[PDB]
Amino acid sequence: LHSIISSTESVQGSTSKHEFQAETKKLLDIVARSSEKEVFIRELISNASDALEKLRHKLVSDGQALPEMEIHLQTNAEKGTITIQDTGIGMTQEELVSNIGQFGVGFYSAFMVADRVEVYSRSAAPGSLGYQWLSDGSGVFEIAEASGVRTGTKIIIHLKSDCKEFSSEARVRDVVTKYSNFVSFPLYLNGRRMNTLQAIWMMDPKDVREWQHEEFYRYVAQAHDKPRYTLHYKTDAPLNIRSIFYVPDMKPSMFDVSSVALYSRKVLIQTKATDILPKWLRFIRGVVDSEDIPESALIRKLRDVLQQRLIKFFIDQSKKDAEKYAKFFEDYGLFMREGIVTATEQEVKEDIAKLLRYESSALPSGQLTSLSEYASRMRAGTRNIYYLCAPNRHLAEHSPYYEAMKKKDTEVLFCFEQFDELTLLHLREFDKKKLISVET
């Protein structure tokens, strides 16, 4: 076992009393009078991770050797406490007094569960002194210089009467595994290394190998096949997004017809995000991580950005490997047709419709075309897109209506899927060209 938490600190003098500022008091009042208490742990772990990253980047910028960089949790049932300590960059006295800002999120989270909070911090800057910070959540906090403070930050939470469950090792273990499994620094609970995983969505896409995606896909999809498609989407405008999307190699089953995990800086928000993607993209598996995450205007914005990017991805795949894309459309194309029918906005219907592939009177049997490719072949004076739904190519070609049209070179899409009729009825037009069935 490997533990660093113990009572090493002492205070030689008296404490200085300070009064919280008005809005901090008002938010402390809200917390006292107001739930999902367990999330204080994931917030504290996240701040510890940020403090460690700050130290690491600073030391690597210099030529300095790296110390042990770890996050530790300790429970004490006999004393009703939970403690977190990390060996990161710590806080100066100025910061401990210069108190939403991530110092604040860990703050209100802690007082959700605490009768009082006891903090020791020492900045990694050379010559830094250690400090004790104390508060019971009233309008006052106390600060005093402390000896025996390890570089970094230790937070001791003296738990409320109704929050003693967080002094149980097993309860805390389960909370850590639920929300904090992908934390990027070593994490220990009561001296035992927690088994945590690698957040590969945060890596630059060019550095993630196929075997890593295969392992991660099988984990997030709880699957045994490989992904037929992988999209690692990283952007910083207009939104922060680090995401990986997978399409299964297997065809969709009934389970897929009846999704994705949501994170924020490697902190789980929802294991199964409800509306992160449009419903028609529910066959996608994977992860979405956004620093911008508190239904909301933001979730709507994120969903629309991801929809556009995934449609672009599939368009680009049809260009990279048309035979592979044709199989994907055969296997997953009912989701696209569903999305066209259920979509409200004409622009969204036409975006999804860019993924449709059909046979054509102008192409060899078996060969597929897109609507935009059909449009590029339209002859001057003919301004509509013509189609015919039939069980197979032979029956379409021997339609008396198609036979007559053949005399004037008009291309006709041949559509064999039973839901093509409804899809094209609902699509109605594409790139300002009406869709017309050549038989009524």
Contact positions vs ligand KUC (CB under 6 A):
44, 47-48, 50-51, 54, 86, 88-91, 96, 102-103, 106-107, 110, 117, 119, 121, 133, 152-153, 155, 401, 405, 438-440
Beta-strand relationship, 114-122 and 81-86? unpaired
Query: Which residue's CB is nearer to ligand KUC, number 272 or number 408?
Result: 408
Query: Which residue's CB is nearer to ligand KUC, number 155 or number 334?
Result: 155
Alpha carbon distance 401, 415 (integer Å): 15
DSSP letter at 14?
P
- Hey, how many other C-beta atoms are within 10 angstroms of the C-beta on 313? 16
Shortest Cβ 130–ligand KUC spacing (Å): 12
Query: Which residue's CB is nearer to ligand KUC, number 123 or number 307?
Result: 123
CB 253 within 8 A of CB 294: no
Query: Which residue's CB is nearer to ligand KUC, number 72 or number 213?
Result: 72
Shortest Cβ 64–ligand KUC spacing (Å): 17
Work out the end-to-end distance of the chain between its first and last CA atoms, rounded to an integer number of angstroms.
77
- Pull the structure tokens for residue 292: 């911008």
Alpha carbon distance 75, 81 (integer Å): 6
- Hey, how many other C-beta atoms are within 10 angstroms of the C-beta on 144? 16
* Proportion of the chain in helix, strand, coil states, percent, rounded to 5: 40, 25, 35
Residues 6+ apart with CB under 8 A from 234: 204, 205, 241, 242, 243
Alpha carbon distance 131, 96 (integer Å): 9
Query: Which residue's CB is nearer to ligand KUC, number 11 or number 315?
Result: 11
CB 20 within 8 A of CB 140: yes
| Local structure of 142: helix, strand or coil | strand
Shortest Cβ 90–ligand KUC spacing (Å): 5
Shortest Cβ 141–ligand KUC spacing (Å): 8
CA distances from 27 to 52, 65, 237, 420 (A): 28, 41, 32, 56
**Residue 76 assigned to a binding site:** no
Query: Which residue's CB is nearer to ligand KUC, number 119 or number 371?
Result: 119
Shortest Cβ 89–ligand KUC spacing (Å): 5
Report the residue number whose CB is nearest to ligand KUC: 106
- Pull the structure tokens for residue 218: 């099988």
Shortest Cβ 363–ligand KUC spacing (Å): 21
Alpha carbon distance 172, 190 (integer Å): 10
CB 146 within 8 A of CB 10: yes
C-alpha dihedral, 315 to 319 to 321 to 325, nearest 10°: 30
Closest CA to 190 of 74, 356, 291: 74
Query: Which residue's CB is nearer to ligand KUC, number 366 or number 391?
Result: 391
The answer, yes or no, to whether the previous bond of 364 is cis (omega within 30 of 0) is no
Residues 6+ apart with CB under 8 A from 292: 239, 240, 264, 298, 302
Shortest Cβ 135–ligand KUC spacing (Å): 7
Shortest Cβ 122–ligand KUC spacing (Å): 9
Query: Which residue's CB is nearer to ligand KUC, number 75 or number 370?
Result: 75
Shortest Cβ 43–ligand KUC spacing (Å): 7
Query: Which residue's CB is nearer to ligand KUC, number 54 or number 226?
Result: 54
Detail the residues annotated as belonging to a binding site for ATP: 47, 86, 99, 107
Detail the residues annotated as belonging to a binding site: 47, 86, 99, 107
